[PDB]
Amino acid sequence: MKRTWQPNRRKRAKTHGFRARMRTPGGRKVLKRRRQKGRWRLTPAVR
Amino acid sequence: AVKKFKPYTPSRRFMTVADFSEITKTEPEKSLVKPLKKTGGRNNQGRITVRFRGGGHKRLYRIIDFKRWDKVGIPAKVAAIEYDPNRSARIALLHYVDGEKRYIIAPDGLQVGQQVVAGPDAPIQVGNALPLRFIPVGTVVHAVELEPKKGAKLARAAGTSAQIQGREGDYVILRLPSGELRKVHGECYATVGAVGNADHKNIVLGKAGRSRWLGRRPHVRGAAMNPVDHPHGGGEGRAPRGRPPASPWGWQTKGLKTRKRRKPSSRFIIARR
RNA sequence: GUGGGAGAGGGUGGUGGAAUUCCCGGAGUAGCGGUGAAAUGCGCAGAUACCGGGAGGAACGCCGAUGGCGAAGGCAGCCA
RNA sequence: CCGAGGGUAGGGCCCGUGACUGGGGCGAAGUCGUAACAAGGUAGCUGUACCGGAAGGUGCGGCUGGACACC
RNA sequence: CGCGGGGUGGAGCAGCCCGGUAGCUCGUCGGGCUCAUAACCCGAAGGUCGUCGGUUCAAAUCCGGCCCCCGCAACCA
RNA sequence: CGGGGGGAACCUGGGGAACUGAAACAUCUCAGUACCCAGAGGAGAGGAAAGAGAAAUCGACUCCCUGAGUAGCGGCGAGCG
RNA sequence: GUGGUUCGUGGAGCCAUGGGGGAAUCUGGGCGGACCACCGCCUAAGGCUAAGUACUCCGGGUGACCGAUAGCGCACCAGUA
RNA sequence: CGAGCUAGCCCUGGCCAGGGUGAAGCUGGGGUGAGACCCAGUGGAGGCCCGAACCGGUGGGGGAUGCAAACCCCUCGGAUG
RNA sequence: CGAAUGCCGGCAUGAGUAACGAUAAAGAGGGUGAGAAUCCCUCUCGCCGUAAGCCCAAGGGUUCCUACGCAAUGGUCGUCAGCGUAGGGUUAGGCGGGACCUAAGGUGAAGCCGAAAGGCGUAGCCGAAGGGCAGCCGGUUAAUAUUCCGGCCCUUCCCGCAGGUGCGAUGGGGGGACGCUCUAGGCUAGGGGGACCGGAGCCAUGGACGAGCCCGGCCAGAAGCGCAGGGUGGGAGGUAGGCAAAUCCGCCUCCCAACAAGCUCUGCGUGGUGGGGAAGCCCGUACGGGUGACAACCCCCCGAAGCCAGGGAGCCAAGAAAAGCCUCUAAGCACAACCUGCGGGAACCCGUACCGCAAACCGACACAGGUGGGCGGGUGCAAGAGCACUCAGGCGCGCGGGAGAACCCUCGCCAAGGAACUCUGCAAGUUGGCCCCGUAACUUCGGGAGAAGGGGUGCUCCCUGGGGUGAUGAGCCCCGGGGAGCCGCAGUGAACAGGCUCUGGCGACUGUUUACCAAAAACACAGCUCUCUGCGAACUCGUAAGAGGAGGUAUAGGGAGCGACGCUUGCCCGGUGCCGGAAGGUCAAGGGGAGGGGUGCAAGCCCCGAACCGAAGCCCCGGUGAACGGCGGCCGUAACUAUAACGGUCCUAAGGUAGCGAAAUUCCUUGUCGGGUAAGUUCCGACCUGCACGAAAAGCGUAACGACCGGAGCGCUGUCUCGGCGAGGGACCCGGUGAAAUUGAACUGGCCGUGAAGAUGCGGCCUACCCGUGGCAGGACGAAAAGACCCCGUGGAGCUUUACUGCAGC
RNA sequence: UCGAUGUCGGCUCGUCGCAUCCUGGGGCUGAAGAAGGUCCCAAGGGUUGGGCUGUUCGCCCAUUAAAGCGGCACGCGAGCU
Ligand SMILES: NC[C@@H]1O[C@H](O[C@H]2[C@@H](O)[C@H](O[C@@H]3[C@@H](O)[C@H](N)C[C@H](N)[C@H]3O[C@H]3O[C@H](CO)[C@@H](O)[C@H](O)[C@H]3N)O[C@@H]2CO)[C@H](N)[C@@H](O)[C@@H]1O
Ligand SMILES: [Mg+2]
Ligand SMILES: [Mg+2]
Ligand SMILES: [Mg+2]
Ligand SMILES: [Mg+2]
Ligand SMILES: [Mg+2]
Ligand SMILES: [Mg+2]
Ligand SMILES: [Mg+2]
Ligand SMILES: [Mg+2]
Ligand SMILES: [Mg+2]
Ligand SMILES: [Mg+2]
Ligand SMILES: [Mg+2]
Ligand SMILES: [Mg+2]
Ligand SMILES: [Mg+2]
Ligand SMILES: [Mg+2]
Ligand SMILES: [Mg+2]
Ligand SMILES: [Mg+2]
Ligand SMILES: [Mg+2]
Ligand SMILES: [Mg+2]
Ligand SMILES: [Mg+2]
Ligand SMILES: [Mg+2]
Ligand SMILES: [Mg+2]
Ligand SMILES: [Mg+2]
Ligand SMILES: [Mg+2]
Ligand SMILES: [Mg+2]
Ligand SMILES: [Mg+2]
Ligand SMILES: [Mg+2]
Ligand SMILES: [Mg+2]
Ligand SMILES: [Mg+2]
Ligand SMILES: [Mg+2]
Ligand SMILES: [Mg+2]
Ligand SMILES: [Mg+2]
Ligand SMILES: [Mg+2]
Ligand SMILES: [Mg+2]
Ligand SMILES: [Mg+2]
Ligand SMILES: [Mg+2]
Ligand SMILES: [Mg+2]
Ligand SMILES: [Mg+2]
Ligand SMILES: [Mg+2]
Ligand SMILES: [Mg+2]
Ligand SMILES: [Mg+2]
Ligand SMILES: [Mg+2]
Ligand SMILES: [Mg+2]
Ligand SMILES: [Mg+2]
Ligand SMILES: [Mg+2]
Ligand SMILES: [Mg+2]
Ligand SMILES: [Mg+2]
Ligand SMILES: [Mg+2]
Ligand SMILES: [Mg+2]
Ligand SMILES: [Mg+2]
Ligand SMILES: [Mg+2]
Ligand SMILES: [Mg+2]
Ligand SMILES: [Mg+2]
Ligand SMILES: [Mg+2]
Ligand SMILES: [Mg+2]
Ligand SMILES: [Mg+2]
Ligand SMILES: [Mg+2]
Ligand SMILES: [Mg+2]
Ligand SMILES: [Mg+2]
Ligand SMILES: [Mg+2]
Ligand SMILES: [Mg+2]
Ligand SMILES: [Mg+2]
Ligand SMILES: [Mg+2]
Ligand SMILES: [Mg+2]
Ligand SMILES: [Mg+2]
Ligand SMILES: [Mg+2]
Ligand SMILES: [Mg+2]
Ligand SMILES: [Mg+2]
Ligand SMILES: [Mg+2]
Ligand SMILES: [Mg+2]
Ligand SMILES: [Mg+2]
Ligand SMILES: [Mg+2]
Ligand SMILES: [Mg+2]
Ligand SMILES: [Mg+2]
Ligand SMILES: [Mg+2]
Ligand SMILES: [Mg+2]
Ligand SMILES: [Mg+2]
Ligand SMILES: [Mg+2]
Ligand SMILES: [Mg+2]
Ligand SMILES: [Mg+2]
Ligand SMILES: [Mg+2]
Ligand SMILES: [Mg+2]
Ligand SMILES: [Mg+2]
Ligand SMILES: [Mg+2]
Ligand SMILES: [Mg+2]
Ligand SMILES: [Mg+2]
Ligand SMILES: [Mg+2]
Ligand SMILES: [Mg+2]
Ligand SMILES: [Mg+2]
Ligand SMILES: [Mg+2]
Ligand SMILES: [Mg+2]
Ligand SMILES: [Mg+2]
Ligand SMILES: [Mg+2]
Ligand SMILES: [Mg+2]
Ligand SMILES: [Mg+2]
Ligand SMILES: [Mg+2]
Ligand SMILES: [Mg+2]
Ligand SMILES: [Mg+2]
Ligand SMILES: [Mg+2]
Ligand SMILES: [Mg+2]
Ligand SMILES: [Mg+2]
Ligand SMILES: [Mg+2]
Ligand SMILES: [Mg+2]
Ligand SMILES: [Mg+2]
Ligand SMILES: [Mg+2]
Ligand SMILES: [Mg+2]
Ligand SMILES: [Mg+2]
Ligand SMILES: [Mg+2]
Ligand SMILES: [Mg+2]
Ligand SMILES: [Mg+2]
Ligand SMILES: [Mg+2]
Ligand SMILES: [Mg+2]
Ligand SMILES: [Mg+2]
Ligand SMILES: [Mg+2]
Ligand SMILES: [Mg+2]
Ligand SMILES: [Mg+2]
Ligand SMILES: [Mg+2]
Ligand SMILES: [Mg+2]
Ligand SMILES: [Mg+2]
Ligand SMILES: [Mg+2]
Ligand SMILES: [Mg+2]
Ligand SMILES: [Mg+2]
Ligand SMILES: [Mg+2]
Ligand SMILES: [Mg+2]
Ligand SMILES: [Mg+2]
Ligand SMILES: [Mg+2]
Ligand SMILES: [Mg+2]
Ligand SMILES: [Mg+2]
Ligand SMILES: [Mg+2]
Ligand SMILES: [Mg+2]
Ligand SMILES: [Mg+2]
Ligand SMILES: [Mg+2]
Ligand SMILES: [Mg+2]
Ligand SMILES: [Mg+2]
Ligand SMILES: [Mg+2]
Ligand SMILES: [Mg+2]
Ligand SMILES: [Mg+2]
Ligand SMILES: [Mg+2]
Ligand SMILES: [Mg+2]
Ligand SMILES: [Mg+2]
Ligand SMILES: [Mg+2]
Ligand SMILES: [Mg+2]
Ligand SMILES: [Mg+2]
Ligand SMILES: [Mg+2]
Ligand SMILES: [Mg+2]
Ligand SMILES: [Mg+2]
Ligand SMILES: [Mg+2]
Ligand SMILES: [Mg+2]
Ligand SMILES: [Mg+2]
Ligand SMILES: [Mg+2]
Ligand SMILES: [Mg+2]
Ligand SMILES: [Mg+2]
Ligand SMILES: [Mg+2]
Ligand SMILES: [Mg+2]
Ligand SMILES: [Mg+2]
Ligand SMILES: [Mg+2]
Ligand SMILES: [Mg+2]
Ligand SMILES: [Mg+2]
Ligand SMILES: [Mg+2]
Ligand SMILES: [Mg+2]
Ligand SMILES: [Mg+2]
Ligand SMILES: [Mg+2]
Ligand SMILES: [Mg+2]
Ligand SMILES: [Mg+2]
Ligand SMILES: [Mg+2]
Ligand SMILES: [Mg+2]
Ligand SMILES: [Mg+2]
Ligand SMILES: [Mg+2]
Ligand SMILES: [Mg+2]
Ligand SMILES: [Mg+2]
Ligand SMILES: [Mg+2]
Ligand SMILES: [Mg+2]
Ligand SMILES: [Mg+2]
Ligand SMILES: [Mg+2]
Ligand SMILES: [Mg+2]
Ligand SMILES: [Mg+2]
Ligand SMILES: [Mg+2]
Ligand SMILES: [Mg+2]
Ligand SMILES: [Mg+2]
Ligand SMILES: [Mg+2]
Ligand SMILES: [Mg+2]
Ligand SMILES: [Mg+2]
Ligand SMILES: [Mg+2]
């Protein structure tokens, strides 16, 4: 039955997207943390 | 007054619809005069701040003239009487002789051929607006300005009206639809007569759905919730209230007066029995 | 048919004054009410009695009769 | 084919009967009060409405088959 | 068993709780009013305080035992 | 002409917890800690007495040692200092 | 009315200041633990000021530091699969 | 950090085989002082009926280291709101 | 280090055990190859066919095509593949999206607010599955195509020539521009039939050389035209309104139309050219290619839910915006500009493979689950997207071969009986569609109602009514009607398709709910009542700004209870809550300074500090019951007895009225009586000793309704007496692949005792050759889960209030 | 035994005890016969169908030679409900 992953490429980048993070102070520190750790991808894939 | 229905269903039984014989138009309204609107009951933060609202038929908002004093002395013919789904009352479409078209809330007694005016000049007859100070004591009156030049706030709903009981200096004493006795400034415009579509109070919704179409959602009793949810609930097997009956936010809902004491408004009120 | 008459005859709309009650103001003090006699009630948080204002509803004194009208029930301030 | 009638099904009317229940008639000397007949001690009666152990009481309107002092 | 209150003239209640005093209304008895009964008026009689034991100078009264009464409780199981 | 944004930890400023301790818990403690925010920089802060405080004394500020778990503070408790 | 201080309302001063009232320029004003006198100390309501101090992304030296289940999560193409 | 599941609301689109009953209204006729009304045809109302799609999840059986971390079979509720 | 249900890794047991993932289904020949049930071809068989076929959107992201491969991946095998290596493949001015519009929302010059981070906000801006906008048919590749190509159309920009005109916009106006249900007339997709047209070929096995049988009889297309539809007045005069100006728009007046009459726009039709084009035979194909042919290319009918499209009608709940578009004037410019037509030019970026109800997406899997739009043929059955078979197309579900035990699951049938089963007809059966007859209580007059209960149902021939289309005719199609016959056990012949009645409880009703053990008598619901709220409303969210409320105004809005409807809803205001009360009482800060104190030589400076004045709140007085709530006890009494209409007394703020009543409430209790039954703790009626009903936490009824809960009957049954037989998928045997919880170690018997009280393990005695397979579950206090009950802990968390103390709010 | 010994009743399947319900054998009798009463021996076998209730039990209908009482974790849920 309907499961929890219902992928929508637009929704993915307007929610977790790079511009999205950059808009909220909560969100900028998400980036700082990922950069400080050396994540290859600071922000999700979406095509 | 009031269409009824043979009971070919349950709830077609006591269901009741208004009498639209008065409506001289339908499928209008004057396209020049109306924008749109929306809400949810939710507010600018997204939050429900009025409960049990939503759904219901899409409406277009008829723009409507509550300042009649900007046309002083210009006459107008009553053009049409049609349906407004934002109010209890019906709106009269009227053409001015300026060629300006405007909406008026329809007094009881307007046939559509008739001329109407507004201003100190103003014959005293149904449909005409004057400042209160020129209207003779005793007149039944609707759509009243509370303060001068600010627009008509009072007696706007189907069947409502007010009466001039007398005057004192710059002010006149009014018996509102509530029965409250109120001073109002002499310079406030008002139009003579009562609102009409007065049988509005006798519609009988008749089924659940007809409440939803008006955008009214189901309303649940405190009684039926849990204690997180409301001052009355739990224990069950029902229960009496267990406590002086209360709103969800905790204040007492029987008897308890909410008007604020120090309002400078109080200096102008004498009543409300 | 014509010409005339009396009448609270019916329907509708209006409208007047007397009174009662309620409130607002004035003045004023120790009771008021009520009954067979009382008590309940009302009153020094200012009652009753008196003056002024106002709100509202109901019924129409004298004319009025042992009277008129109406099929009966009934119909009574005044105007159309 | 029709056909006495037998069967299955559903109605109608009438009689009988029924735990129980409603009043009613009737039965010398049981209990409670006094409503009515004399302003019957509240004139009575009345349709209706509410009430009350009971008779009755009270409201609104009605009928007379009720009415020598005093204001 | 468990906890609380109770038992007083014929009926119904005070008084106990603060030791010495037993009261109220009805009823009953005698008399009056009345042709007579009720009503009403004038007088009166009537009890050992459930019972047993203790405390004290003195116990309806304070204490304990039993005997009846009314009441609440008896849950997780 | 300048600002903006970034920087491991360190610094100042604005704000600021709870578990826990108290062998329960409110004052108290943990603690001006964790965190969040703003601004510095290679350091930051502070600094030249409207100071100490008993000696007719000492002389700006910072940091270390000591004074000293002293003086005090404290449901005069746990503790704090 | 509060915060700071060892100071928890305490005899509670000092420094700070959200609110009300509200001065003077040497004979002026703050202070020395309520307050008063005396004797002292100091000059608020403007600002800047190296060094001695903290820290370690980074470079180097040295270990009675580990030796692939240890030492950083990662000795290996790891903040990766 | 999450409303890509889920709950509500907002905006904008879309879907609902086929059958069954036959409201008001209108028309004509009767009726009447004039009406109410009665009848007939027409008409096509309704959180109306039957029943697919779509939405559900009634009862039972199976499954129970499953095909499946909610499934399958049979039956069954709504289906212009 | 031996233990921590320790941690990390490795390897065991269970065990060659269970499974190998839908019961749609396979068999043979030939080919390739080291190797073949599994790959390729053919033939036969079976399965889907409102799908299991085809197209689109999401999402996935090279999975697409081909060459060479088989270690692994594939629940077996694999020579095959969605897998490995490599190479190749996605072509647009017109399709989608952007150099267009605006919607919710978002964002945000101005502005407002907030310790900081930030919050808000008009204009603007962004934002789409909405509005706007120009491409149809075929052919082509291994693989792309409205993209390349062929044929035929079309749009914008740019520049030029001609003709026209007051030109000109971010501004004004028009339009765009809209619901739901029903729906006319004309079309098209689509489909059916033809004795008419075209075509390879066929006579089998008894018959048939035939008006035989099988195959096909279209597609697109500018202008012009025709049919059908949409939209639409014309002229003047005045003109104060449309935040400037308008000639436009609006408004008034007069004049002609009254009609699509015209003007205009779209649909279809036809149209120059263009292009398709079967069965069959042949080769030869993961695929399709010659021919059939020079193909034919036409009539009739059925007919949309699609089109004309802003069509029409009715109803109430009253049904987006903005740009493109046209019109109007403004500056401004009138050489310009704009309009119209022709011509040349110029016309960018991204998507484009493939999967796409699934082995390519969401579900850790090649997973019986989930996933929006469109097409979805034929026949028959009343209709239909239902059901059975079947086109095209696509599949036989990636372990097989046997055997024919128990047992299990899914299914079939059953003598006699018929609920005797059982908590309960649970289950299963009966019934079943359509037409016709017929149909009760009661009822809110609609219902109840498919009530119930019956009859018909096929085929052949005769006669015959009405309709649609054509002509009024045939033909074709739809709807019947009557008459006479035939066959079977049976004609809705197979498939899909109510069992029914009586009577209670609860809820009026359709609805709603615990995703995943509860669908209900719970929630909601129209409706009734109370209450607050005069509008910068009350209320709610927010520190605030602001917002909702509501662009509403008491016939409105918030809160609360009750819950259609009918008849109704008593008494008590002592307490509590709310409401009213200008007095009195007490009251905090502040005002007040009687008086007292410290210290100074003193002037002073500095502490205390009585009376008194002084808010709300509490006290006090009163009102309030669809506010919280509450509505008695003992004793006596009637000419049989019983009983008590009646009295007595004690208490209360007041003592339960109506109506119900062993109840969804009744303890005693299976109360007593009556009904039903052969028999009734249930159920129905009644009585009233109501432990412990009772009136809006409503009381008592109520037609209709219900996957609710109770009681009875009929019908019918494998529920049962009581089992039997049969089918299929497992189970069993063989080949291939091959798990799991669990496991101190094991050489693991019975009894009677004993033992921490329930011994394979200790004692005595009995019994017992070693090892397995198929089976059953009594025991290892069997596995699983550090018992959820219970207690403990000065453990924890949700919840309440006249617990304490705070805080917001007021 | 709380790092789990599932708990009433039904059903299925039984097995054992005897304090015997029946059948067999007996003594006594207030045993004429028949038919009972009571006590003794005896565990081989047998011990019904149904209404009510979840019920065990119990009452009841119709029968019977009889309609026995107990134990087996109130026998038996890795057997079912
Ligand atoms: N039949 C007359 C009607 O009945 C009623 O009358 C009935 C009663 O009211 C009346 O009862 C009366 C009683 O009122 C009166 N005051 C006392 C008297 N003894 C009783 O009488 C009764 O009692 C005894 C039995 O013991 C019988 O013998 C006697 O016949 C009988 N009347 O007796 C009648 C029944 O028998 C009313 N009067 C009224 O309804 C009407 O007139
Ligand atoms: Mg997941
Ligand atoms: Mg998307
Ligand atoms: Mg979304
Ligand atoms: Mg990288
Ligand atoms: Mg937001
Ligand atoms: Mg509502
Ligand atoms: Mg409501
Ligand atoms: Mg509700
Ligand atoms: Mg609840
Ligand atoms: Mg919550
Ligand atoms: Mg609460
Ligand atoms: Mg409650
Ligand atoms: Mg309860
Ligand atoms: Mg209570
Ligand atoms: Mg007369
Ligand atoms: Mg016959
Ligand atoms: Mg017959
Ligand atoms: Mg009388
Ligand atoms: Mg009398
Ligand atoms: Mg009298
Ligand atoms: Mg009398
Ligand atoms: Mg008399
Ligand atoms: Mg009375
Ligand atoms: Mg004594
Ligand atoms: Mg408990
Ligand atoms: Mg910086
Ligand atoms: Mg700070
Ligand atoms: Mg502690
Ligand atoms: Mg502790
Ligand atoms: Mg604690
Ligand atoms: Mg601290
Ligand atoms: Mg800080
Ligand atoms: Mg420095
Ligand atoms: Mg500095
Ligand atoms: Mg500095
Ligand atoms: Mg500290
Ligand atoms: Mg401090
Ligand atoms: Mg402090
Ligand atoms: Mg201090
Ligand atoms: Mg000092
Ligand atoms: Mg000085
Ligand atoms: Mg100072
Ligand atoms: Mg000092
Ligand atoms: Mg000092
Ligand atoms: Mg100093
Ligand atoms: Mg510095
Ligand atoms: Mg280094
Ligand atoms: Mg080494
Ligand atoms: Mg390592
Ligand atoms: Mg090694
Ligand atoms: Mg590691
Ligand atoms: Mg959502
Ligand atoms: Mg969602
Ligand atoms: Mg129909
Ligand atoms: Mg219909
Ligand atoms: Mg329906
Ligand atoms: Mg239906
Ligand atoms: Mg239905
Ligand atoms: Mg249905
Ligand atoms: Mg189910
Ligand atoms: Mg809707
Ligand atoms: Mg050890
Ligand atoms: Mg095994
Ligand atoms: Mg096996
Ligand atoms: Mg197997
Ligand atoms: Mg070969
Ligand atoms: Mg070979
Ligand atoms: Mg070979
Ligand atoms: Mg088909
Ligand atoms: Mg895509
Ligand atoms: Mg393999
Ligand atoms: Mg092109
Ligand atoms: Mg585009
Ligand atoms: Mg854009
Ligand atoms: Mg460009
Ligand atoms: Mg754009
Ligand atoms: Mg835009
Ligand atoms: Mg700004
Ligand atoms: Mg914002
Ligand atoms: Mg825009
Ligand atoms: Mg778009
Ligand atoms: Mg579009
Ligand atoms: Mg396009
Ligand atoms: Mg093509
Ligand atoms: Mg122009
Ligand atoms: Mg417009
Ligand atoms: Mg065609
Ligand atoms: Mg056809
Ligand atoms: Mg032959
Ligand atoms: Mg053939
Ligand atoms: Mg065609
Ligand atoms: Mg054509
Ligand atoms: Mg050829
Ligand atoms: Mg239209
Ligand atoms: Mg724009
Ligand atoms: Mg392509
Ligand atoms: Mg599927
Ligand atoms: Mg689909
Ligand atoms: Mg596929
Ligand atoms: Mg998958
Ligand atoms: Mg598979
Ligand atoms: Mg699948
Ligand atoms: Mg599926
Ligand atoms: Mg779907
Ligand atoms: Mg079709
Ligand atoms: Mg059919
Ligand atoms: Mg089908
Ligand atoms: Mg398989
Ligand atoms: Mg049988
Ligand atoms: Mg039978
Ligand atoms: Mg039975
Ligand atoms: Mg069943
Ligand atoms: Mg019925
Ligand atoms: Mg039938
Ligand atoms: Mg029925
Ligand atoms: Mg026949
Ligand atoms: Mg036949
Ligand atoms: Mg046709
Ligand atoms: Mg079948
Ligand atoms: Mg069927
Ligand atoms: Mg059916
Ligand atoms: Mg019935
Ligand atoms: Mg019952
Ligand atoms: Mg219901
Ligand atoms: Mg429904
Ligand atoms: Mg329904
Ligand atoms: Mg619910
Ligand atoms: Mg659930
Ligand atoms: Mg369920
Ligand atoms: Mg249901
Ligand atoms: Mg607030
Ligand atoms: Mg607002
Ligand atoms: Mg607002
Ligand atoms: Mg608004
Ligand atoms: Mg409301
Ligand atoms: Mg309720
Ligand atoms: Mg009441
Ligand atoms: Mg009463
Ligand atoms: Mg009270
Ligand atoms: Mg009171
Ligand atoms: Mg006072
Ligand atoms: Mg003072
Ligand atoms: Mg002195
Ligand atoms: Mg006060
Ligand atoms: Mg009071
Ligand atoms: Mg009873
Ligand atoms: Mg009860
Ligand atoms: Mg009953
Ligand atoms: Mg109740
Ligand atoms: Mg109540
Ligand atoms: Mg109720
Ligand atoms: Mg009831
Ligand atoms: Mg009912
Ligand atoms: Mg339902
Ligand atoms: Mg139900
Ligand atoms: Mg069987
Ligand atoms: Mg078999
Ligand atoms: Mg283990
Ligand atoms: Mg052995
Ligand atoms: Mg043993
Ligand atoms: Mg076993
Ligand atoms: Mg087994
Ligand atoms: Mg076991
Ligand atoms: Mg276990
Ligand atoms: Mg434990
Ligand atoms: Mg639990
Ligand atoms: Mg404790
Ligand atoms: Mg605790
Ligand atoms: Mg245990
Ligand atoms: Mg264990
Ligand atoms: Mg024996
Ligand atoms: Mg024997
Ligand atoms: Mg014998
Ligand atoms: Mg035996
Ligand atoms: Mg035996
Ligand atoms: Mg039973
Ligand atoms: Mg029993
Ligand atoms: Mg036991
Ligand atoms: Mg047992
Ligand atoms: Mg079990
Ligand atoms: Mg059991
Ligand atoms: Mg067992």
Numbering used by the authors:
A (entry chain P8): 1 to 47
B (entry chain 11): 2 to 274
Lines from the paper:
In this work as in our previous studies, we employed the full Thermus thermophilus 70S ribosome co-crystallized with long synthetic mRNAs and natural tRNAs. We determined six X-ray structures of the 70S ribosome programmed by 30-nucleotide-long mRNAs with AUG codon and E. coli tRNAfMet in the P-site and the A-site occupied by tRNALysSUU bound to its cognate codon AAA or AAG, or near-cognate stop codon UAA and isoleucine codon AUA. To discriminate against pyrimidine-ending codons AAC and AAU encoding asparagine, the E. coli tRNALysUUU contains one of the most complex modifications 5-methylaminomethyl-2-thiouridine (S, mnm5s2U) at the wobble anticodon position 34. Another prominent feature of E. coli tRNALysSUU is N6-threonylcarbamoyladenosine (t6A) at the 37th position of its anticodon loop.
Thus, we determined structures of complexes 3 and 4 where the SUU anticodon of tRNALysSUU formed a U·U mismatch either with the first or the second codon position. Two additional structures of the near-cognate complexes 3 and 4 solved in the presence of antibiotic paromomycin, which stimulates miscoding, supported our previous conclusion of the antibiotic mechanism of action. In both cases, paromomycin stabilized A1492 and A1493 in the ‘out' from the interior of helix 44 positions, hence stimulating A-minor groove interactions with the first two nucleotides of the A-codon. In addition, binding of the antibiotic led to a positional shift of the A1493 phosphate, resulting in partial alleviation of the restrictive decoding centre from the side of the mRNA codon. Finally, in the ribosome structures with paromomycin we observed a displacement of helix 69 of the large subunit towards the D-stem of tRNALysSUU that, most probably, enhanced stabilization of a near-cognate substrate on the ribosome.
